[PDB]
Structures are given as C-alpha cells and as structure tokens.
Ligand binder design. Structure first.
Ligand SMILES: [Mg+2]
Ligand SMILES: [Mg+2]
Ligand SMILES: [Mg+2]
Ligand SMILES: [Mg+2]
Ligand SMILES: [Mg+2]
Ligand SMILES: [Mg+2]
Ligand SMILES: [Mg+2]
Ligand SMILES: [Mg+2]
Ligand SMILES: [Mg+2]
Ligand SMILES: [Mg+2]
Ligand SMILES: [Mg+2]
Ligand SMILES: [Mg+2]
Ligand SMILES: [Mg+2]
Ligand SMILES: [Mg+2]
Ligand SMILES: [Mg+2]
Ligand SMILES: [Mg+2]
Ligand SMILES: [Mg+2]
Ligand SMILES: [Mg+2]
Ligand SMILES: [Mg+2]
Ligand SMILES: [Mg+2]
Ligand SMILES: [Mg+2]
Ligand SMILES: [Mg+2]
Ligand SMILES: [Mg+2]
Ligand SMILES: [Mg+2]
Lengths: 116, 39, 52
RNA sequence: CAUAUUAUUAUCUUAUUAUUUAUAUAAUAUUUUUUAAUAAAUAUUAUUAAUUUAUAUUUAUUUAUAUCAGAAAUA
RNA sequence: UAAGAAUAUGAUGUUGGUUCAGAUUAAGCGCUAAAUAAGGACAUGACACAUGCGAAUCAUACGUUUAUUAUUGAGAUAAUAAAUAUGUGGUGUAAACGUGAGUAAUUUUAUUAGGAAUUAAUGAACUAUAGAAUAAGCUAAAUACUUAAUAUUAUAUAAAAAUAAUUUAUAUAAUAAAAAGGAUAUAUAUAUAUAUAUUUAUCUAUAGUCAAGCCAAUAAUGGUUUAGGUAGUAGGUUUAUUAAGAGUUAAACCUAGCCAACGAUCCAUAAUCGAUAAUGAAAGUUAGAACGAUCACGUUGACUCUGAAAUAUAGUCAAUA
C-alpha cells in the first residue's frame, strides 16, 4: 500500500494549499547503541486547506505535485489547531463583554462614593 | 536585450518580495511581552 | 566475507527466482478477502478519510 | 607584480540546430484559364510539353528568441 | 570469544606520548631462485600513438557475368552448371570490450516484500493461436523507396462495489493503422499465364516471455577560518510538450515563500557496492586490483535524426592534435 506517516502540522497558512508536517520514525543508532527518533519536515498538499498548526494528521503518498510535494493530508487525527483558532476568536468577544460590565460597576461604585 | 528585460522583471519581482517580507514583519501585532497592550 | 554468514555462508549470489504467476490468482480466497476487506483509519489508516 | 585553469554576465561576437514572423513572375506535385509540337479517324478531337492560376511539400530570403564556442569584465 | 612489551623517575605510583611483537598487499626495491598446477598483472599521463588485427554475412531479395545442351537467327529464350557483394538491398554493431575523466546526488548507488501519472491502440524478438498479404509510381529491377486500397480511447445507457472513484457490460464515434516475395515440385490449359502444394520469408491482432520510463522513504567524505543562501527561487492556477506526474522545459498570471548551527549555500576530494578481498575476539575499519552488480565515458562541448529506448564510439557544427 501507499506510504503513510503520522505527524504534527508545524507550519500552515504560508503557502497556498501546502502545509509543513513534522514526522518522526524509530531508528537504531549503533554508534551509541540506542533507539532514537529521526525527525523530518515534509511539504504536504492540503486540498480544502482544513489543517492548522498543531494538528496531528496522517499524510499519504501521492504522485509528485510540485518540486517538493509528494504527500497529502489523508486524515485529521486530532484537531487542536482548529480548536485554538476557535478559542482565539471567541475570547475576543467574551473578554470585552465583562470588561465593559465591570467598568460600569467601577463607575457606579465611584458615583456611590461621590454622592455618599 | 531580451536577457535584460527578463533580468529586470526578475529583479523587480525579487525586490517586491523582499519589500513585502519587510512589510509583513511590520504588519504584525507587536504586543509588549512584559507590559502587554497599552491600555 | 563475514557477510556470507548472513546467507548460510554461501559466497556469491544467484539471480532472484522469477515468479511464474506474477499476480495473485482468482483461486486464492485469502488475498481476495484481504484486499476486499474494509480499510482501516486513524493511526494505521490506509487511504483518505471521509471528509478529506 | 607575473603565469595558468574553472565559473558567472542587464556586455559584444557567434557555427549549428529548433522555434518564430514576414517575402518570393523561387522550385516539385495536384486545380484552373490558355499557348505549343504529336496522334488518329474523318474543321478537328484528344494526348505529351511550356504560360497564367490556387492548395499542399520543400528550398532561397530575411524578422525574433535560445544555443557549442570565443572576446571583455568580475570572482 | 578480547594476553601485552621497551622507553619516565635518584627510586616509587600515576598521567602521557613514542616505538615494538601479529596478520596482510593491486605492492616496489636489494640479494637469491628448481619443476609443476592454479589465480592475477599501468594504481601514474581520460598523455601522445608507428604498424597489424578486433564486424561481417546473405548469391534462395534484386541486378551482373560466363560455359554446355536445346530450340530458335549479332543475338533471344529455356534447362543445367558455375563465377560476381568495387551496382542496388536486407540483417548485424543501444550490445560486448575497455576505462574511471566527470559525478557528493537536478536524473548517482544501495535497500523496500514502497508507489502512480492508474506509464502508450510502442515489440525490440522469440513462443502459442488466428487472420491477411491489394494497386499503381519510381529506380535497371526488387523483400529498395513513395502514394493509394483493405484489416484502444472518448461519449451515452445501465450494473455493481475493493466506492465518494474505479471496474464491468453494452451502443455509437472515430480507431484505422500494414504487408513480400524468393526456392523447389507438379497440374492445367493457351515459352505464356494460371492452381495447388512443400519450403523459408512479410504484415496485422491477442496473450505470454524478455524488457523499458517516472516518483517516494532511508543511507552515502572533509572544510562554517564557506553562515547566511535562494528569485523558477517555495507554493498555487492554466496552456504547451511527453506514453506519463512535476517550475522538467517554454509562456502567462498570482501568492511570499523554501533551505539553513541535527550544518544550508559554497569549496575541495572521490566512480559506487556485495553472499568480494584484508584485518580484528567482535563492533567495526580498510580496499573497491581480481570475481560479480550498478553507474558514467569512449579526444572535448552542444545539438539533431532514427529508434520502444541515444544528446549514441552515429550524423551536424565547433575545439584540440
Ligand atoms: Mg503544482
Ligand atoms: Mg630516558
Ligand atoms: Mg609490527
Ligand atoms: Mg598464468
Ligand atoms: Mg589507468
Ligand atoms: Mg584504479
Ligand atoms: Mg542471384
Ligand atoms: Mg553491396
Ligand atoms: Mg554502451
Ligand atoms: Mg565493463
Ligand atoms: Mg572515476
Ligand atoms: Mg512493383
Ligand atoms: Mg519494405
Ligand atoms: Mg529548478
Ligand atoms: Mg506544469
Ligand atoms: Mg514561467
Ligand atoms: Mg556544509
Ligand atoms: Mg576522479
Ligand atoms: Mg571509499
Ligand atoms: Mg573491480
Ligand atoms: Mg581491471
Ligand atoms: Mg556517450
Ligand atoms: Mg585515446
Ligand atoms: Mg562526449
């Protein structure tokens, strides 16, 4: 079957339809007699542009798509990148609401002291 | 002539990309890591 | 020639044996069922997910 | 300070080749309109061969791009 | 299946280098050398080369040329013998052989029980079956060359599922693309044709063999006193070209990326590897001469034709001699 890898999206949104996926594999270093992780960064095709930095995704081998792109996102295993963007957007309004509320409370308390 | 035209097209393109790299570096939020936003 | 120890201490090589039948045949139900089985997904997934 | 080789070019020159515009009373075949020497039967009618004509395939001519390699400069 | 030794020091213990004992060679040199069997032999100038050889073969492709017999009257045609490849043709030289210049990965090597673009109406040259082998023109003639005749993919309908596509079947569309005859026998008829055959050839189709093209993953020397590099550069979208993906090459438009202190880019150096050789207790290290595998090149560079496949030891142009 096609070559499949599991990796973390480490760079998205800087290239059109392309992300960077960091994958790790188990290798044996005989010089130090140790099982190590060998790391690599892949340029990966993303049709739909659904992935975000920090997602755990499975990439699959494809035909050559550019000079350096040979893999495509096949599945979003874990989607922490999308959740981060959601919370980023939500906190903007969430904070500002109570920020205005408590400023109102501060001004009302100031006025209460004023008219004593 | 044609080489000069192509060279200048490439030079303009490269300079545009470098200037846009600088502008993108300038178009960032730049919050103070210590004191946060001003107010 | 200590590499020969990995191959029964036989020095030199033979050409690899060609397969008379170069694809699995129809009278082999195990491979047919294996290929025609559902394909896994997740960490050991093989193919594109539903929405991708 | 002197000699040598390698690479690069908003430079110059450039065999060859490939593309690329445009031009041929330019050719060889098919299409016409006509002019020539033969044929046969009884004014010809047909054949072979030149003129003009319009489609292909080539050559000559150039336009433009790239190009072995040199030259100049730089490393 | 892992052994140490000499040399510090006034002496001691320790650190520490140097050297030695062992094996070996693609070896050279000095001295010496009997026979036989086997394995090898320009590592350096990919420096220059005298001379001779290493790729020819087919006469049953077509043409020539003689001699005898026969008929016909200088010749003509048959039959039988021969000679001819300084004429036209076919097949054969992409292999093998040699070499290691270049090449540190832009196409190189090694590995994988890896892939797709789902590699073409491609067979190169043998099997197994089938079907064909038709006309002119041109050369002196032809199995030489021309022209002409005849012989999977895209649509649409459904089916399913190894499914968000592929596969299957059908119907169309075009596929729509060839060829070749020689040697012997006879059998007819009127030397002429013809009809059969036995031979060896030609073409087409299907499958099988043998084979080709492309991509991924991992690994592959030293120097950062080479630290920033890169503008087709990194990616997207189309068109062209290709059997076929891809900034591979050409054109256009975009986005601003890509690589790099786990070492980029640059520079230098080097053909690479093994169930091959050396060595060691082993991990490893060394070699890459021999045996084998792969690559690259055939004085140097680029391009082109043919071809399934060539920047071919071919051809064109240039350089060197
Ligand atoms: Mg692309
Ligand atoms: Mg001493
Ligand atoms: Mg010793
Ligand atoms: Mg001998
Ligand atoms: Mg040599
Ligand atoms: Mg050598
Ligand atoms: Mg003959
Ligand atoms: Mg001849
Ligand atoms: Mg060869
Ligand atoms: Mg060889
Ligand atoms: Mg070499
Ligand atoms: Mg003929
Ligand atoms: Mg022929
Ligand atoms: Mg490039
Ligand atoms: Mg493209
Ligand atoms: Mg372009
Ligand atoms: Mg470096
Ligand atoms: Mg070398
Ligand atoms: Mg080495
Ligand atoms: Mg060798
Ligand atoms: Mg040798
Ligand atoms: Mg060559
Ligand atoms: Mg030579
Ligand atoms: Mg050469």
């Amino acid at each position: 079957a096609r070559q499949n890898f599991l990796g973390l999206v480490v760079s998205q949104g800087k290239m059109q339809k392309t992300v960077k996926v960091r994958v790790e594999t188990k290798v044996f270093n005989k010089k130090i007699n140790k099982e190590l992780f060998h790391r690599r960064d892949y340029l990966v095709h993303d049709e739909g542009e659904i992935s975000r930095e920090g997602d755990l995704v499975r990439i699959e081998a494809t035909r050559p798509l550019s000079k350096r792109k040979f893999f495509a996102i096949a599945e979003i295993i874990r989607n922490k990148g999308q959740q981060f963007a959601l919370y980023e957007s939500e906190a903007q309004l969430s904070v500002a609401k109570e920020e205005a509320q408590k400023a109102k409370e501060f001004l009302d308390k100031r006025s209460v002291r004023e008219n004593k | 002539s044609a080489k000069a035209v192509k060279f200048l097209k490439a030079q303009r393109r490269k300079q545009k990309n470098e200037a846009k790299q600088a502008t993108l570096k300038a178009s960032t939020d730049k919050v103070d890591p210590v004191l946060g936003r001003a107010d | 020639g200590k590499g020969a120890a990995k191959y029964g201490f036989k020095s030199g090589v033979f050409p690899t044996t060609r397969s008379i039948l170069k694809s699995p045949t129809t009278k082999q139900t195990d491979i047919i069922n294996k290929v025609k089985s559902p394909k896994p997904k997740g960490v050991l997934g093989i193919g594109y997910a539903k929405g991708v």
